[model samples]
Target: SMSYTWTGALITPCAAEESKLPINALSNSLLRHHNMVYATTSRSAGLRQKKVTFDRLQVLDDHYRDVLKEMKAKASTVKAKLLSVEEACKLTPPHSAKSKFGYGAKDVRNLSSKAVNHIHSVWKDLLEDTVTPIDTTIMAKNEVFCVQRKPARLIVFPDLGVRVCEKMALYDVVSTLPQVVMGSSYGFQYSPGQRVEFLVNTWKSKKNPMGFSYDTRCFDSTVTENDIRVEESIYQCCDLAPEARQAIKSLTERLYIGGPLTNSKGQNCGYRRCRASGVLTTSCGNTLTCYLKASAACRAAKLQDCTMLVNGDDLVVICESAGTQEDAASLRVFTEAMTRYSAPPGDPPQPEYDLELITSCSSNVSVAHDASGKRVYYLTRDPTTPLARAAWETARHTPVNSWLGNIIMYAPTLWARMILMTHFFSILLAQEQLEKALDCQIYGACYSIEPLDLPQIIERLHGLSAFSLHSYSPGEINRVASCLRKLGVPPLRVWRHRARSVRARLLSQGGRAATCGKYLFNWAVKTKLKLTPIPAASQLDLSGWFVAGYSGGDIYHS
Candidate 1:
C-alpha cells in the first residue's frame, strides 16, 4: 500500500470555449480533503467515550466561511467597479444630458475594449497576485487524490531519546515477498481486533495547550500507577521474545527524546498513542511482526537524531521510533570504528549516547484514568533516569493546537504555474481547455463530490473541510471539468452574475454525444449551441439572477 496508488490520470489538451463538462459535474469531482488524524489503534470501545469537541472545529468552520464569503464579495465588487469604470471611459459624446444618458448600443459596444482591460486588472489584483505559480514537481507531490504509506511508529521517551529499532524501518526495502518456509503465503495485514501498543505518560504535559487535561481521557479509558501493567501488556501484544522478557524487566521502556523537530500534535494531545509497539500485515493481508524491536523512528521529520546500539546477538527488532535509524546507526558505527580502529559488540562505542541530554528521570510511573474503569499505567526506562524524568517533567504541561495545512507561493513566475497546471490536467483531464465565459459557484454544508473511481479516490466530500488552490488563469477550470466527466460525476451548479443555481442529486441524461456538438462557446449576450444541450435548470421560477444556460443543448437548462 505504500508504493503506488490504485488511482490513475490521463492527459487532455485545452481548447478555447471548449466545454469539457458542466460545472456541476466538475464540482462533483473535486475531492474535499479533510486534514484529520485517525486513532491508529482499533482495539476496543475505549475510543468511543472520547468526546468530540466542537471548540477547535468551530474555529475552523468560521475561518473557512469567512474566507469564502470575503472572496465572493471581493470578486463581485471589484468586477462591477472595473466594468463601471471601463463603461464610463467608453461614453463617447460624454454624458451631460446629451440625449445619450441610457447605455446605448454604441456605448456598450465601445465598452468591450475597456471591459477586457478591466477584467485583466480585476483577476490579476484580486486573485492572481495571492497565488505563487506552482512548480510541476511540487504539484506531482501534491495533486495526488489519494495516498498510502507504510505506517511507522515512534516513542516519546522520558529523556526524549526515542531509540527506534532498525528492522521496521526497512520493511519497504524488500524487492519481493520473503520466501515462505513452506506455505505460499508471504504475509498478512495486521488483525483488526488488536492494535500496536505503546506506553504513554500524559502527566508530562497535562497543562500544555495541546496537552491532556485532568478531565480528558483516551476514548474514555482510565488507569492509575497502582495498575502498572503496561510492560506486561506490551510483552503480550508484541509477542515478546523469551530472552527479551528475561534480560529486560519490562518491554515498556521510557520515551526516547534526542529526536529532531517533529509534529507537535501528540505532545498537544497529551498521549503518545501506541506508536512504539506496532504490528504489521503483508500485501496478502498476512501478519509478520517484530522484524524490528522497540519504537518507530523519526523517518521523515527533521529532529534531534538518536541511534539504537544493537548487540548483534540473538536479538529480534520491532520498529517503534520516529525518524531514520540507519542514518544514526551508521554514524555511530563509523565513529566507533575510527576511534578504536575496530571495537566489536559489547565494547562501548565512542559516541555512547545518541544525543545531547536535556533531562531524564529514574523509576518514575504515571497513572491515567477516566470516569469509567478504563485505566493505563506507564513507566520510564533509561540508563540515565534523571535525564528521562527531567524531560518528562518539562513536557507534562505542553499544549495542543490545530495546525492548518496549505501551500502558498508568492513570486513573479509563470513557468511554475504552467507546468503545475499541465500536471494537474494530465492527472485529471486527458486533454481540454477552459471556457472563455465564466460564471459563479455554489458551496454549502451539503455539497459533496460523488465517486470518481471505484474503491479508490471516492468523489464524495463532507462539509467543514480545509482546502487551498492556486489558479493561474481561467483555462484550468475546463481541464478540471473534463476529467470529472470520465469518472461519471455530476457537473457543478454555477450561475452568472448573481443568478441562483440548480440543486440535484443525479442528472437525467437528455442528449447523446453524437447529437451534441463537439464544441460550444459563450460570447457577448447571445446564446450559441453546437450540439444538443443537457438541461441544467429543471425550473426557472427560483433560478437566481445567475442563470447557467450556456449548455450547448442541455435540455435541463430550460
Candidate 2:
C-alpha cells in the first residue's frame, strides 16, 4: 500500500531532556565526535513557547502579483491527469501507517473490498464536504544539520486518505510552479551539478561580494493563519480546474489553516494554532513566501545587486559587499524587514568569505578529484540519512529512505559512490533486485527508480563527472571517515576492494548491470568504457526532475 507519512518517530531516538540517557543517544553517538555532521542538542534556545502571531499582513504588491501570474502561467502548461484510485493506492508504500478505520496499506493496495470501499468513502467525503478539518499525526524529526544534532523539529501532516487527495489537488502545481516563478531562485529546481554551477557563477559574477546563509527559526510555526490564506490565494490565482480550485480552497481553509494535533498514543493533544508542518503545501508555500520576502528585503537593504537561492526557508544570498561596516548594517536592515514580514532570523546570518562555508539545503560545496586526479567542486551533505537509509534497508520491512535519491543526486561524492553504492547495490545484487524497480521522490514527483538505470541516472545527473571526480576536501574525507567508523561500516578502501570484484562480475554479466559496472567503476579500469545514455532513461517520465548532461561515449572530466 502506498501512502504519505506524517508521524515522525519511526527512527527518532532522542528528544527528552531529563532522561538518564541522552536523547537520540544511539544515533547521536553514532557520530559523537563528528561535529562537522552532527549537533549534540539539549532543549534548544529556538523552542516555541507562546503562540506565534503575525505583526502585520503581507501586502501583495506588484512583485507578489507577478509571481502569482507566472506560477499561474506555468500551471496552465501542466496537464496533470488525476491518478486513478488504484494507481493512487499503489503509490502508498507497504510500511505506511495502517488506516485507523481498520484496513492496512496492504489491504488498500490490494484493493480489498473493505479498503476500496473505505478509500472511495474518503474521496467522496472530501468531495462532498469542504469544512471538515483533516487530522494530522504529529511527531518530532531527528534530523542532522551541519552544526549538530538538535531536538527534532515537530512535523504535522495529513492522514493517508487526505494525502492521496492532496496529490490530486496540488502535487503537480507545487512541483512545477515554483521553478517557473522563481527561476534559479527556486532551489529545488536544480540538480547538484547545476547548484554548484549557479553558486560558482553567482560568486564569480560579484565583486568583493558578501555571501551568507539565512535561517528562519521555526519557520513553519511562524506561518500565521493569514500566511496560509495568502498561499491559498496564490493557488486560486492559478488557472485550475473548477474541482481543483474548490478542493484547494477547502483544504486550505480546513486542514491547511490549522488542525487538531494527535500524539502517538492517541492522546488528545492541543490543536495547532499556526500553520501546520508536513503537509503538501509546506515546502512550496515556504519557498514562495521566502523568495518574496527575501527579494523585497534585499531591495530594502539596498544591498548591491544579488542572487537569491532559496530552499523552503533556507536562504543563500550572494551580492556585492559594502565593506564590513556597511555589510553589517545592511544585514541588520534585512533582518528587520524579514521580521516585520513575520520571519525572524534564527541568528545573525553568518558572513562567510567563501560560498563553500555557507551551507544551504543541508549541503555545501566541496572539492573532489576526478578520475584523472583533477579537482572538481560538487555539492555534498553529511551522510547521516544515507547511512540511516542503508541501515533501514537491511530489514525486510522498513519505511522508504533517501538512499536511492541521495545516490542519484550525489553519485560523484566519495561517500555516495564508494560506500552507499557498494552497500546498497551489494544488497540488491545479492537479492537479485538490481533490475527490480523501486520508488523514490525527486523534485517532489515519485519516480520508478531502478538500480540498473544508475549508470544513465548517474551520467545524466552528474555527467561524466561521476567517473572522473575523485579527491574530496580534507574536511569531507574526515567526516566520511568518522561516519564510517561510527556506523561500524567498512572504510572506502574496503569498498574499493569490494567494488573491483563487483565490477568484474557486473561487466561480465552484461546488459544494464554491465552498464552500471562500466560507468560506475570506470575509476577502477585502465581504459574506461565510452559513456552512453541508458536506453531506459528516455522512457522515464522525469517531468519534475532535471538532468545536467547528455552525450554518447564522451567523457567530461570537468
Q: What does the lDDT read for residue 228 in candidate 2?
A: 75
- Residue-level lDDT tens digits of model 1 in 335-428: 3322221112233222212111111111112222322334423221121112111122222211110000000010001221122221222222
- Global CA lDDT of candidate 2, please? 0.67
> Residue 368 in model 2: shift from native, Å?
4.0
Task: Tell me the RMSD of model 2 versus the true structure.
Answer: 7.6
TM per candidate comes to 0.18, 0.78
Best of the candidates, lDDT: 2
Candidate 1 runs further than 4 Å off = 1-28, 31-163, 166-217, 220-243, 246-253, 256-558
Report the Cα lDDT for residue 433, model 1.
19
C-alpha RMSD of each candidate structure in angstroms: 30.8, 7.6
Candidate lDDT (C-alpha), each: 0.19, 0.67
